[PDB]
């Protein structure tokens, strides 16, 4: 759902 | 898509330690960031930071970097989240999410 | 830090009403962002991510719309079962920020 950060 | 599932409420003396755990379940624990937050009646809902399973990474908010260490066990598909140093102020219900599901809190009340 | 602006903060409803709650963004947040309800002493449940996805299980009744800054969230018959606390949150970046809240109320 955003992921990596 | 199922579950997080959070352990029980705690009682603590001040100054002392408190680590949490957030079960994941039906899913792939290693694909997903958990995040931990922080409710309060005063200050609303915080972020405190998160944790990739997969490649082990985190990322906190700078109020809780030095209070807060997050991390993650792939073999049980549990992510837990240590807080040192409590006091009064770390009275609240903590809540791991995935931004779409959220385990059910643990209460935390610092007294003596 | 991103701001979220949640308006209003409380509001007096009938039920059978079509609400609207919204929030704005300090920055384009290229709707990354959730909205979800909290029930007294419960923990929460998303209704819808992304800006305008749907959760498994959610009524057709809620409905999400926005882009850039300005997102929305429409009640469009409201129910019993629908009272309880709305928040909005982006996720576009660290830190995660939420709104501050909007508390519905049957008006009398």
């Known amino acids: 759902l955003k992921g990596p950060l | 898509q199922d579950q997080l599932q959070q352990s029980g409420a705690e009682l603590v003396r001040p100054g002392a330690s408190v680590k949490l755990s957030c079960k994941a379940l039906g899913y792939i624990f290693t694909d997903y960031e958990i995040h931990w937050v922080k409710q309060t009646p005063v200050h609303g809902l915080e972020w405190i930071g998160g944790?990739?399973?997969?490649?082990?990474?985190?990322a906190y908010n700078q109020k809780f970097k030095g209070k807060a260490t997050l991390t993650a066990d792939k073999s049980s598909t549990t992510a837990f989240m240590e807080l040192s140093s409590l006091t009064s102020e770390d009275s609240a219900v903590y809540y791991c999410?995935?931004?779409?599901?959220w385990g059910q809190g643990t209460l935390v009340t610092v007294s003596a | 830090d991103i701001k979220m602006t949640q308006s209003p903060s409380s509001m007096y409803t009938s039920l059978g009403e079509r609400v609207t709650i919204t929030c704005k963004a300090s920055?384009?947040?290229?709707?990354?962002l959730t909205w979800f309800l909290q029930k007294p002493g419960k923990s929460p449940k998303t209704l819808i991510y992304?800006?305008?996805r749907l959760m498994i299980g959610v009524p057709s009744r809620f409905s999400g719309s926005g882009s850039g800054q300005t997102y929305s969230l429409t009640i469009s018959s409201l129910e019993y079962e629908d009272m309880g606390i709305y928040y909005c949150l982006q996720y576009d970046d660290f830190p995660l920020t939420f709104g501050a809240g909007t508390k519905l109320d049957l008006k009398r």
């Open positions: 992304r800006a305008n």
């Open positions: 920055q384009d947040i290229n709707s990354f």
């Open positions: 944790i990739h399973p997969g490649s082990s990474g985190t």
């Open positions: 999410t995935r931004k779409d599901y």
